[PDB]
Design a binder for this molecule. Structure first.
Ligand SMILES: Nc1c(C(=O)NCc2ccc(F)cc2F)c(=O)n(O)c2ncc(CCCCCCO)cc12
Ligand SMILES: Nc1c(C(=O)NCc2ccc(F)cc2F)c(=O)n(O)c2ncc(CCCCCCO)cc12
Ligand SMILES: [Mg+2]
Ligand SMILES: [Mg+2]
Ligand SMILES: [Mg+2]
Ligand SMILES: [Mg+2]
Ligand SMILES: [Zn+2]
Ligand SMILES: [Zn+2]
Lengths: 66, 47, 261, 242, 261, 47, 242, 66
DNA sequence: CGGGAAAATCTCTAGCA
DNA sequence: ACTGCTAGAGATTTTCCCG
DNA sequence: CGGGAAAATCTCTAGCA
DNA sequence: ACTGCTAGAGATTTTCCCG
């Protein structure tokens, strides 16, 4: 039930930016998706990012490679 | 309170001081003589 | 410093010397010299050296008009993916822009558009089209092209591709469509190593899938978490950390000093 | 890795596709595809169909995505090959279009349309369109009073059909369905790409006979030898190109 | 890859796809796709993302003309220090530029000037003035203002200072001289925390002093050093390292594997 | 030998290939149809 | 640090300036200045002198740096206060000009020149100029045939005088001398600045009576107490402001 | 004789740049000055810099502070 | 573990009126 | 109350590959 | 050694047609 | 064969200062 959906959501990759950094940070793991905020985990670091600074994909090249 | 010195519309001159009404990331909202303007923070200085 | 300060103030009123010069020439602390400069309106001629960041939400589109060979090309870009749409139009008219936008809204899920303050984009016809299509309008700060930097860059990119294929088409409209095709499906890069079309499909499908998944999870998972405070709604937990939403303020706390009911 | 034996047993019992088994048993999709395609007993997104219709003396060119019901319709000045070629080049630039079905009309069989298809890499072949035209005409009749011109009403009808009309198995709309179908097509193309990369390799493990390569990941190396999939560590295997 | 390569070449001839796209769509190594792109003249539309560095030798001056209030200001800058000279002139004439340059050469040690290719700077009169004053002329690459970036920046700076003091002067020439004064002696910063005048005095005095000191040292210190080679002239030694000049090629070697006679 | 593709004088178009005669830091000297040009390395690509 | 005692002995024996002793005994210039100025028995760069001359019906305005012999001369349209003010503002912007000597002429005593001096911070006061004018006229006569106009010949003469004429104690030119003198003036101003910063401090060492501060460097703290310079470590001293 | 002149030359500060770096490197110590090249020492690192990339000063604020 | 080649990531720039 | 970016040419660092 | 304030260094941008 | 830079507004890191 819940655990399968949870793992499915963590299967999504997130590219984000910070307030003053113009470089997009690498593909963090998605944990929660809200209306205006997204909760991600980037190398054992949990961050909360505004929706306006987050691109959430799946990366199909990679899903199909493992 | 803050003093804002800005640059609004293709005018190379700098104006101010104006009352800072709002501050965001990359832009500010100021009031200069009952005229509210929105200026990118690249073209503004807040003191 | 009273004597040195008063001397420095007159010296600045004459020469508008910077804080370093007055500190060196009147034996002033850097704070006092900086205060002397900061109180002169004639020296406030520079803004902070940063940049903002445009909205990148999945429903965000940036529209602009560019000019090529004496003709007008109306271009929209999906900011999240870089997927472009372009059409050559007879004139920079409000009805032409409204027709373009109605087509775009009927073909893709457009929730808001970000345009500059050109006369066509500010027309009442475009406003009515946006109202009918359920599109919000965000207008950039006037004379600030950086506010729509994405589309601006796309303009350049689009023109570049046109310059590569102009001999393959006799009209400009056909070359514009060729360039749109090439950008959307023949150029690979970006976050997923994607094309723009692949990336936009991924972005939209991911939005739908994540929405449905989170809806089901919040339907099943239902808990209230106390920490340190009121009954914050549980959002996520694990690995010794719990993310909660207390009074519409999402925050991360360690698993220690936290109870879940 | 560990779930290959369970996956083969599950496939033998139910003949399930690779996506379900790859999701259930945490296997890379290449291995799941291999065990799906190793049993002889267990053995669209790019096709659009176009037609020109008429309403109020205006010819409307309509393309339908067959798999999803997605429509792209616009009012063209005249039922001419040039307008059809422009419409098709636009559609190919907006969506992945591979095959187009027409009705041997004068415009669709023109040299301009053929040249456009050749440039865009679209294949030309000569009942969904009739029902879709009927639904489009119904929607246009419903929203005609909201627009002075026919082109705007056509675009409003396209908007309503693609995003404001919901039905089917899951109660989705045509735009949602087309995005889902194209995403699946992207996944299929990526999987085929990876199979193409790894089919040119040969693995010698433990040395035994040549074997095809399936996976080379973080844990170990998964190969297939004599219709039997095995897993071996790196130092116990040698991967070469033939 | 022969089949995939030939397919990719036709695909590129149609669409001019980048190496990533053809590698993804024809199963090509990145080297081969990059070679396919690199062999198409229609895709070579971008230069390398770097910058040069202007000459900063002590005898280096950069000259330019700027325009303010319908009048012409001829500006020179000493690149090493940032010390400026400026004069308002009736017209952008060759004789006016030659007179300005003769004044500059008579007041400071000017060894060469770096100007763009404006008509006044390329005039025969300026060439004769430079020949009489012993000044070499280095002309920038045409339509490349960055080649004289220093003076360009100074232009902006100079104008800024004029904008600060324009009310203190009724003519523009007086305000220009006020701005020159303020820049040269009332603005502090740079490498030595200096003013431009202090920095130029330091640069020139240091050049003279170091020249005389090194002349005396080379007069006294006279040795030949072998290393690893021929009798390289000794330049400097100590701290386990010896800097030598072998066949007009200055090089640093460790004290080990080196003999001094 | 090298192929140089450049951009010389206020022309947004790119030309080439040309023979690379000299390479420095920040600029190159090339020959395009018996015409020797000096181009900043910002406006040139060497292959 | 260690060389203070030797430096005082050397000063008592020869009454040398601080620069020589600071160079010889590796002391900070503040300490050398202090021991130079502590003996009662051991006790220009900004002054320019201007005049207007005449040649071929043209008035040439000449400023001489008295200390070095450096000249700035140019042909002005008329012997008027406005031209003099413009010339002086230019000179003040090109060199550090503090005092100007004139000859009570109509132009030099004008309100425009006074206002220019006030803005530029130049003091006005009312034989070198005569000799300098003679030398300038001689050089102009020598290089007249090389220029059609008088202004160009004047500038050529200024060039020759400032850089191509070498003489004096060291065989230098006027430009070299003026750069050396201004560099020395910069050093003097910096030393005075530092003395001004450190004269407002009081040091209590070992606690003993209040002492003035001389140096606070890398090694230790050098102070002066009862006309005797001492050196103490940081933790054995306390520096405060009064 | 020679040693005093050598120390005097090392008393000069050099600000330099490298071929591809647009940032001026800090005040290295001057060791040798040539027609077109300058030999400097920057934090126990001996470098040879073209004259066109070197600004040699003395820093009078600092000579007079020790 | 040692290099070595290939991939990946980082740096930086023009052009977008 | 809004907001520079994007894609390519090199340069430098990481990673995979076999012994 | 521990913070804390002041200095110094680093980052980054507009304007120079 | 020639060549972006400069100075100011913040931000972040180093250093001096006293216990
Ligand atoms: N100057 C315009 C630019 C433009 O300078 N680009 C270059 C450009 C420069 C920097 C950058 F970071 C991005 C860029 F792109 C541009 O791109 N577009 O689109 C424009 N469109 C409309 C109008 C005029 C609007 C009518 C008056 C409205 C007043 O409220 C001006 C422009
Ligand atoms: N465009 C000129 C600029 C100029 O764009 N500045 C802005 C500018 C932009 C970028 C930069 F990094 C530095 C800058 F300063 C400039 O500054 N000056 O001085 C110029 N001077 C003369 C001529 C025309 C020369 C006559 C034709 C010669 C052909 O051989 C053009 C220019
Ligand atoms: Mg626009
Ligand atoms: Mg634009
Ligand atoms: Mg110029
Ligand atoms: Mg210029
Ligand atoms: Zn001021
Ligand atoms: Zn190409």
């Amino acid at each position: 039930e819940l655990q399968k959906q949870i793992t499915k959501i963590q299967n999504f990759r997130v590219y984000y930016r910070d307030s003053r950094d113009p470089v997009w940070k690498g593909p963090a793991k998605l944990l929660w998706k809200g209306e205006g905020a997204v909760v991600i985990q980037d190398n054992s670091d949990i961050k909360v990012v505004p929706r306006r600074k987050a691109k959430i994909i799946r990366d199909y090249g990679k899903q199909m490679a493992g | 309170n803050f003093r804002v010195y800005y640059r609004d519309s293709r005018d190379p001159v700098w104006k101010g001081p104006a009352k800072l009404l709002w501050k965001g990331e990359g832009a500010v909202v100021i009031q200069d003589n009952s005229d509210i303007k929105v200026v990118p923070r690249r073209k503004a200085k807040i003191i | 410093f009273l004597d040195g300060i008063d001397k420095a103030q007159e010296e600045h009123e004459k020469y508008h010397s910077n804080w370093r010069a007055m500190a060196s020439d009147f034996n002033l602390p850097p704070v006092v010299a900086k205060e002397i400069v900061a109180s002169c309106d004639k020296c406030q001629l520079k803004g902070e050296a940063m940049h903002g960041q445009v909205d990148c939400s999945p429903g965000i589109w940036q529209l602009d008009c560019t000019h090529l060979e004496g003709k007008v090309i109306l271009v929209a870009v999906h900011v999240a993916s870089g997927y472009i749409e372009a059409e050559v139009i007879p004139a920079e008219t409000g009805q032409e822009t409204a027709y373009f936008l109605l087509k775009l809204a009927g073909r893709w899920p457009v929730k808001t558009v970000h345009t500059d303050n050109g006369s066509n984009f500010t027309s009442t016809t475009v406003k009515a089209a946006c109202w009918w299509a359920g599109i919000k309008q965000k207008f950039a700060i006037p004379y600030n092209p950086q506010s729509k930097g994405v589309i601006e860059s796309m303009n350049k990119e689009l023109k570049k591709i046109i310059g590569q294929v102009r001999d393959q088409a006799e009209h400009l409209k056909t070359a514009v469509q060729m360039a749109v095709f090439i950008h959307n499906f023949k150029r690979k890069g970006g976050i997923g190593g994607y094309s723009a079309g692949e990336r936009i499909v991924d972005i939209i499908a991911t939005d739908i899938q994540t929405k449905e998944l989170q809806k089901q999870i919040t339907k099943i998972q239902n808990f209230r978490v106390y920490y340190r405070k009121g009954p914050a709604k549980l959002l996520w937990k694990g690995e010794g950390a719990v993310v909660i939403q207390d009074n519409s303020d999402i925050k991360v706390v360690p698993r220690r000093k936290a109870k879940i009911i």
